[PDB]
Amino acid sequence: SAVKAARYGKDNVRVYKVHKDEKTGVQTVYEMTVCVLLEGEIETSYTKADNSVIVATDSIKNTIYITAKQNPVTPPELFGSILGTHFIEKYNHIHAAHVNIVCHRWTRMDIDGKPHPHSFIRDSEEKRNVQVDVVEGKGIDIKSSLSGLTVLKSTNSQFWGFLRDEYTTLKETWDRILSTDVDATWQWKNFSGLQEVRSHVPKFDATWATAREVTLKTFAEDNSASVQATMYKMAEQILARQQLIETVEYSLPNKHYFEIDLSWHKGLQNTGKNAEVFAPQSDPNGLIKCTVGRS
Amino acid sequence: SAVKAARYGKDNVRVYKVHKDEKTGVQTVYEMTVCVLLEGEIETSYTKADNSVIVATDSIKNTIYITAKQNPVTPPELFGSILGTHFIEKYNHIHAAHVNIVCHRWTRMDIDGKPHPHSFIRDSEEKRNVQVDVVEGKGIDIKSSLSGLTVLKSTNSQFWGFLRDEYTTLKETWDRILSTDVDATWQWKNFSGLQEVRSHVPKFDATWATAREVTLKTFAEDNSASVQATMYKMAEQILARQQLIETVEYSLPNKHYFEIDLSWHKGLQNTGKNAEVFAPQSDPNGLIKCTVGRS
Amino acid sequence: SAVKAARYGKDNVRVYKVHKDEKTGVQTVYEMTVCVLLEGEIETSYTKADNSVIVATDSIKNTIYITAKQNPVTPPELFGSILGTHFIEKYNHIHAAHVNIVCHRWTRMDIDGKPHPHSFIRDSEEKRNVQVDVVEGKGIDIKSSLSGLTVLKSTNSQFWGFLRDEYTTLKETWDRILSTDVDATWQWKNFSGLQEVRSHVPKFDATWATAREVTLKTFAEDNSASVQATMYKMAEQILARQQLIETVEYSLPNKHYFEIDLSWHKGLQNTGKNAEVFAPQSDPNGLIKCTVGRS
Amino acid sequence: SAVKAARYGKDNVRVYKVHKDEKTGVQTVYEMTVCVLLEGEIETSYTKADNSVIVATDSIKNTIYITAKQNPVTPPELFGSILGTHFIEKYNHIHAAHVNIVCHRWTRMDIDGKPHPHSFIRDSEEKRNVQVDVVEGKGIDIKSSLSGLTVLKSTNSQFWGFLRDEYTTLKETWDRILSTDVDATWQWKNFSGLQEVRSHVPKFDATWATAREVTLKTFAEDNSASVQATMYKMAEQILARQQLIETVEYSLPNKHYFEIDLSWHKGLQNTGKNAEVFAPQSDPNGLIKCTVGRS
Ligand SMILES: O=c1[nH]c(=O)c2nn[nH]c2[nH]1
Ligand SMILES: O=c1[nH]c(=O)c2nn[nH]c2[nH]1
């Protein structure tokens, strides 16, 4: 037998950082969960019990904290690139670092219509994420995403004209509820190294904001023919607005809300045009994916 | 042996309702999870296998949907009171109904600075809840709450002057992070029945809003001497603003963020006044409770 | 306003302890999650910012570890009583301690039909729990429980003869699936203090084992007329086998498995006597409770 | 823009099946969660709102139930292959089916030392899984796995001789706790189609059993030099015992249990050779992966 692939590191490293403006008194907080996995010439730790090649996962944890102390943690695309580059440059025998960052929301509170200098609220479990792969001699590959964005529209969704055969019971509809949890990922063109990532720093927050705005507006305004058709519209617009993105991937559950026939009870009308009360279904759920790239 | 207490019913009943304004085209959605448990002369179902006394839990589920079809579902204090009253009036041998409702957020989307007529976002997992106990001959007892309100302040929290003995290692501090998940419950004076609950309908949403506002403002503005002292201030203000509330209960975890000493690494300074990077602790957590009533 | 009730302490304290037999080489592990909440003359910490009355929650955490170092941690009824007694005896102004312990399974591995001296498996998320309330001048109240015991029987469950009215759609049945997650609690007679708890030490593990065995056997062997009837049989037997128990409480969800009518597809028969494939329902679920005591 | 990749289907489809032996009265239950995602000539559903190419996800759900009615559901490798093959053969324009199955434990109860004919217990959240990819003209690729197998050993784990530099604080150790949740996957050689999968049916359950046994025995008996070294031993043995496996992949968290220094309290000794009470850490955790193949 032989080692075909190996990677190891530290997962679930929670990190908080505060920035204090001494001039204005305003404080800003960042909180993330970080995972770093390394690859390189480490096979002998598996095959020969040779620990001399192992950068201890405990040390990886220390390094994350030290790196956060000495560098900006925002945008996360930059922080992840700094962190990954550190490992491949510091250790001769480590040739790839894989950094995953989940950013948690701490949104500044408004108290009496004024932004508070040091108080924050977690407004939703929506996350902003990055996956950064730093590979020696091959540059930096960055995938940015948003996830956990949960939305619902109560009308202006349709689904008709699908294949019907002996396995089909679903009725065609011209008016249904559409609800989903959005997972959207945009993949950047490969960067040659840290200098190039630094040169594009302003684009990272701006593209996240654009991706979010396009997702929300398109969902709200599209008279949707299907999840497939609406998601493609979203992806098309993101690609049009940021030339440095190569592909956009969406993964959308279709979270079903079923009509409840109440006609058995005193002829109560609660279906079709008379539908008011519905039963949200926890499972199963449709799952629709697509990756859109350039012609 | 004898049955000392018994209750049974249906839990985890998910319900969605939409309201459509035909005049304006505006739609409003409500989504809840409902539990209804009944008590009464039902001992023989346990002791003698006498099912004749059992209103099937499946029927309880049907009743929830039918009641939602025929009545407003907001405020939840009213809906819960209607639902509970139904069971004690309809069934001679049922003498108490216990209704728990969890309301999920569906907040109308703003698209281009305009409220959208039929599109919604789940902005946070914060819930508004009610517990309604309807007891034949004893009226209606309502406890309203908010839960899952997660906040953090990065300064203006202190904790010093606590008991020190041979079990104590905690250092006194004049500047720390304070973060919690707020669970706040206000208990209404007993109501004589549905007519009285109806007479107070406007107070329910207004008191929820007040409870939320007082919680947020007090948390943000108090130079906190302890979780205990800050929570008492919150409760005092709610009681002062709504005379129909008898007690206010808060249950607050203290979600700890620890300093990280980095001095072992090149004398890096990251403690006390130099603290920038902290480690959020998943567990353990302080848990502080209090119930405040009138003199 | 006035403080009507207050309690505070530390939750989610994870503790592991190992016992090493030097003679045999055999090691035994225990892992628990502990919560301790205190009450007493602590109102001024809430109302006057007087921290002098506060035993810091951090110190409570230290005390749990120290107590586990110096005492047996099994049975949990004994450990909880030792821990609670400590606080009321050590601190003049603390008058009640409330200790909750969740015990996690680490079951010794069998390797080649022989018990291994130091290797363990988590066989299920079933827990054994205790709630111990130690109140100065009022003794020690102990509630022991098992929870998270998930079972299913595929036949020998019935449900017919229930109330039918205009809210009823459920069909009577003489053969259904019954599945539940068992939560069973037995409440001990009040103990005068630690000496009395110590005198009954052997009864704690034996009664847990009896409660588990009675639950499993009764579930498997009863031709069940309802969840209500089967659960009462369980409780009756536990009370008969341990005179020091005052009450037994069961709380059982009814986790529904629905028939799937496939007749629309080529006349496929999958209902009643021909039912083979079913759809487990995640929600809603029946919830049935009862507390059984002595005549 | 262009569609680069697309797949869609139904996730979280819960399925239960019962087998009844009329001769012996013995019943056996199977419960799974199934996901099926399809690929093929479906781009126009995204780009042109052409639903004519869509097999509705609702129909996919129906098909899962019908297939379970008409075929054995065990071993899951066979069921998944039948299910995936159905879609590529039935629909001209569907060219790949991706089937994921999670099998839940329902272990027959022993009552009074005798196996019960129709009563079952969920003994642990350990799962047996399959991923089956059926691709038209390219055969059937099957990855089998076990996951959620949680184990701990209290001694006979070491970790010393790792890289030490200015980022290192971890002390070398010759005696520590080792605990993990095992995720192990074995990848079968490509199969030409359903006939070939059928020909190897007995190997599926036998190889799962071998993988489990090798994992448990090796964990218990290895005087572990590191997670890396122990996991490689496991993988090597599985490959040696089943020639039809091409690769074995393990992914293991290192779930840390920390010593607690209690020396500050009355010189209490709880470190090194005197360590009895430890603090399980919820996060962070080491994460170690490896894929082992043939020379
Ligand atoms: O078994 C281990 N492997 C590792 O790579 C490691 N790093 N810290 N502790 C460790 N333990
Ligand atoms: O065992 C049951 N008890 C009940 O109260 C009930 N209601 N519906 N189905 C039921 N099954």
Ligand SMILES: O=c1[nH]c(=O)c2nn[nH]c2[nH]1
């Ligand atoms: O606000 C606090 N209250 C407490 O009771 C406590 N105990 N430790 N830290 C604490 N912080």
Ligand SMILES: O=c1[nH]c(=O)c2nn[nH]c2[nH]1
């Ligand atoms: O938008 C949808 N897309 C689909 O593929 C589908 N299948 N059933 N319902 C559906 N809705």
Ligand code: NA
């Ligand atoms: Na390198």
Ligand code: NA
């Ligand atoms: Na009544």
Ligand code: NA
């Ligand atoms: Na006392």
Ligand code: NA
């Ligand atoms: Na095909």
